Symmetry: C2
Subunit: 59 residues, 2 copies
């Protein structure tokens, strides 16, 4: 159980930090909101969507 | 200037978090090289490569380095 709890903790940490990154990018994009600002903001939304998706498999 | 400082500090927070993510992925990686084999390591190798590629994109777009 201790070692399984360690593996679980390492997966949960990755999941938690990925959700934090999603929020940091959201603040970045929200705060910055002309095409180039707009285009970076869409790119950030897309990067956020991606890492959210990829991280879903972590459960 | 308020807008510039706020953007710089937001990009800094992105840098910090992405550094922390990369460190956590390194640890998760040790455990996968040891916890067994089969479906889940190959599932993990898929997921890890995708995660690191998502991080590379974030760096390209946010430019945190």
């Amino acid at each position: 159980m201790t070692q399984l709890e360690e593996q679980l903790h390492n997966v949960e940490t990755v999941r938690s930090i990925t959700m934090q990154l999603e929020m940091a990018l959201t603040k970045l994009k929200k705060d910055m909101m002309y095409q180039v600002w707009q285009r970076e903001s869409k790119a950030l939304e897309s990067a956020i969507a991606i890492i959210h998706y990829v991280a879903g498999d972590l459960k």
